[PDB]
Amino acid sequence: MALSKSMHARNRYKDKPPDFAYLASKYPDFKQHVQINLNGRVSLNFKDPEAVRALTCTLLREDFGLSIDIPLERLIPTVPLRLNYIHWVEDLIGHQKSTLRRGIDIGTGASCIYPLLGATLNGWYFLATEVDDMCFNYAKKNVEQNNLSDLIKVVKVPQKTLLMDALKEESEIIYDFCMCNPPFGGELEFVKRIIHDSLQLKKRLRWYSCMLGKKCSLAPLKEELRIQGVPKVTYTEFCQGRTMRWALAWSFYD
């Protein structure tokens, strides 16, 4: 699969990109990090992480009613890039109408963006896992301060553990999906550990997914899934300016 403008059609920002002037009119904490470029237009220095944090936190408040607090020392998620994945997962699990859907977020991060977007947008239940202590605290706090503790269960999982170990203190039988952004041997090895877990869980999880940061990772994993004899394998490509991502999903369903 390949989408128009290499980003989801139901993405808010494909047709309506952030208007920095409008956001600086409404949000003064965002107005500081805004600068007037060599053309007279309201620009943002994307090479500065304080500016990006301001952008992410502002977008989540204006366009999603989510008030998050994130540290600069940990990965700042790009809201329109992460948003493509939510809609892609909506498509896989066949999101329409009013039947509860259960997800797993391997490495949820400081922002807990995938669960906060999912639960807000579609009312999805989430098991958000984090190995990092700081991220776990920031994520539990962000879910707590957005009254989504009923829908998102944030859990600190040990350093080595992955998907099977996350379903330890869990009693749910069928999970509609698992989404994940692996951290930066390497990436391939990580996703391969998910593949091996997916072979253990088979149909207990409807769709297993991944958001890859390196193109060189896609061809081996597609092959890895084939040699392990995985029935359904779908993969797409996303964008947000110069930053590219490769989404990869697989199912044991015929």
Author numbering: 1 to 96, 100 to 187, 222 to 291
Task: Cite, word for word, the article reporting this structure.
METTL16 is the second m6A methyltransferase identified, and its known substrates include U6 snRNA and the human MAT2A mRNA that encodes for S-adenosylmethionine (SAM) synthetase (Pendleton et al., 2017). Here we describe the crystal structure of human METTL16 to reveal a methyltransferase domain furnished with an extra N-terminal module, which together form a deep-cut groove that is essential for RNA binding. Consistent with the SAM-dependent methyltransferase activity of METTL16, both structures reveal a Rossmann fold composed of a central seven-stranded β sheet (strands β3–β9) flanked by three α helices each (helices α4–α6 and α7–α9). In contrast, we show here that METTL16 is active as a monomer, and it contains a large deep-cut groove that can accommodate structured RNAs.
Two constructs (core, 1–291 aa; and ΔN, 40–291 aa) encompassing the methyltransferase domain (MTase) were expressed in E. coli and crystallized (Star Methods). First, and most striking, is the presence of an N-terminal module (1–78 aa) in the core structure that is appended to the α4 of the Rossmann fold and that consists of three helices (α1–α3) and two short β strands (β1 and β2). Indeed, when mapped onto the METTL16-core structure, these reveal a positively charged cluster (K5, R10, R12, K14, K16, and R41) that forms the entrance of a wide deep-cut groove. Taken together, our two structures reveal an architecture where the MTase domain is attached to a METTL16-specific N-terminal module that is essential for activity.
